[PDB]
Amino acid sequence: SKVVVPAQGKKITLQNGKLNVPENPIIPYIEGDGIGVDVTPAMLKVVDAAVEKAYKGERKISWMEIYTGEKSTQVYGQDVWLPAETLDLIREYRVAIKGPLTTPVGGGIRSLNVALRQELDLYICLRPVRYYQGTPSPVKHPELTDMVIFRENSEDIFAGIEWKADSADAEKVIKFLREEMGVKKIRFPEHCGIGIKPCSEEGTKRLVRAAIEYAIANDRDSVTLVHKGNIMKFTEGAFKDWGYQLAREEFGGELIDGGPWLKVKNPNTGKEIVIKDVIADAFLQQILLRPAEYDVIACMNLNGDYISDALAAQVGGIGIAPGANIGDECALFEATHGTAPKYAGQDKVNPGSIILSAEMMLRHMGWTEAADLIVKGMEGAINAKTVTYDFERLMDGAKLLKCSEFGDAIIENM
Amino acid sequence: SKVVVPAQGKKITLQNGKLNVPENPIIPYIEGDGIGVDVTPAMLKVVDAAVEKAYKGERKISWMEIYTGEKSTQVYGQDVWLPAETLDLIREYRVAIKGPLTTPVGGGIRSLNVALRQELDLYICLRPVRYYQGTPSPVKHPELTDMVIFRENSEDIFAGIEWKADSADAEKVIKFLREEMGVKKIRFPEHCGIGIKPCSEEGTKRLVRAAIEYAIANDRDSVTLVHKGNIMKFTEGAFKDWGYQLAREEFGGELIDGGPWLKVKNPNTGKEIVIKDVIADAFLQQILLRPAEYDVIACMNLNGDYISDALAAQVGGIGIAPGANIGDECALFEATHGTAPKYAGQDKVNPGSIILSAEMMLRHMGWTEAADLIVKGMEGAINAKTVTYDFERLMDGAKLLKCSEFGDAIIENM
């Protein structure tokens, strides 16, 4: 039923991992709710301008609006938050980009952000954090952070397997645990909520295969597995040991003096790449105290939420962190931040997050030149101290811009 | 069998929450492994000196060494890491203090740190983080952090309920989940590890009763419940709702304009105390960006590990964060940091962590005057720029001290 597909426009296809991208591709976008209505028109305007500039008119994206969240009940009936159509269309057109979504409390509907991250088996959440020169940071040295986070998106506590305290189904499970498994370490059995965290060999090896093939393709110095595997041994600890098994078995890892750390040679370059582990709690400290030691980070779903959002804040970026969820059959690039409805409609928020998830969308397609021009413009707009609420509420001798006008500032700087 | 109890010395007793503390109490201490051998002699020397100074000889602690960890196999037989005796002695003498412990990989023994935190039902892990003036920090403004963390220590994923991938007992559990509970959200059932996170009404209400009675006793401004309850609804989300139920039902909380936040009046002072919630991932950002908004933090076991260790690093404190595990029948104060055996025996590490878990031990006993003198000396030693490896490897125009000599510096400053 009612979504409008373009006339001038052809669709992206696959041919084993490598995808065939037309001169005139159809790219789906979901507006987002709240500030989605402000930031998405600006993201469309600078991507279009960056491809006019780089390819001098040969290439053009035909943009196709698809629906999720609030904006979808308005179009299809107040109870459908996620239309099956949207799922069949990202799988078919292969790359899409979304603005913020937040899910309603009241219907026992789970994070829409996360129902898509998994109904489409988009198992890699990739969030790069670098310092853009000139951003207000709270830390003294934010320039040392050039990290790339690879977060497992189909597992962990984040999958949604849990039952309400005192419910039918939850008591059955505690009877099963005390009686048939011989478990005495639940301090209080009565009026207790239980949740399940799973971690599989297959599930973690495809995230670490993905993170190490990225270290190779991009001349990167280290791959740090972070985990709290000293207390959660068979989930998170199984993840560091399966992650090191895979760098031995598929990549020819060798030891560094007496372990535990391994060496991988970069086939294309000859630099030695390091495969190390740091307990997740000690890692939260090591990112503030010693950030140049780490580059690519691989980890399970919950820790990656945490490290991204902690690193993003440290470099000045809550409002500008990019994000992609990449799978085997398709990818979805998104704004990382909330919906923020207090400020929606009145054009003020920073659109950098969704614009930089678009630089990412563009180099995924292999339109590196348009991607590199969007990061030239963002680097300039910011250096020109010509900026938006969030960066001016914190900076001296800067000029204040609306969301519209900041997009224009990025174009002006290409 | 062989632990030596002192002749001059009487023991602490209880009388409903309030404990009767002698002039000459027996306090157990566990040396710790690794740097435990360096830092514990210095902690004994400054506590003894602070009670000579404050009470001009009337009071004296009779110190009694008890055994856990490495140092216990040396004394009782290479397989006993935790002698039941140690458990019966902290319950009997009621307060003890320990240096670092790390558990052996190889016997399927769980964190000793954590077997004591729970076989003694020490459900409050309390870790205060303030900035000591003069400490090297990585953040621009570390002085804004004056926070007190209340971490639930008997539950969460941290309890140890999990089974190895492909094991007998783990397959039984996945058959039970797929077949009898109708669960289809385990992406890969085969070669999967499962873990259990529980959260009870009783378990969380005694941690939030404890954290709010601390806000009252200490003129404190906010109580922030942190949680990832937007994705883990029936564990972590049950925790924010049970925590707000308890501030209504036992403390007379009222609403702040339209929710969700509540107000509690301080009976002894009349200041209004705030009861707020922040999603745990957004909180990791808010501690760097906006730290003056938060004061007392309450949260489940895993997030509290994380927030303590993240806050401690931000204020310059990895090596000096204090810690107490407090229960209904007893309390154990500890060093927060690792064993660090590369540097053990050669007197160089910073003993501030275990010395400040001792200031805490002392005001728990109601010897506030000795406690206040230890924080005067630490404030001075540090201001005098007369300090140890970790603070000199990072500071200009400072004098370097051994662990021994830094204790002496704290005494000199009282």
UniProtKB/Swiss-Prot annotation, chains A, B:
Gene Ontology terms describing biological process: electron transport chain; glyoxylate cycle; response to oxidative stress; tricarboxylic acid cycle
Cofactor requirements of the protein: Mg(2+); Mn(2+)
EC number: 1.1.1.42
Gene3D superfamilies listed in its UniProt record: Isopropylmalate Dehydrogenase
Residue numbers marked as site, Critical for catalysis: F158, K228
Residue numbers carrying N6-acetyllysine: K140
NCBIfam families xrefs: PRK07006.1 (NF005425), prok_nadp_idh (TIGR00183)
Protein name: Isocitrate dehydrogenase [NADP]
Organism the protein comes from: Escherichia coli (strain K12)
Gene transcribed to yield this protein: icd
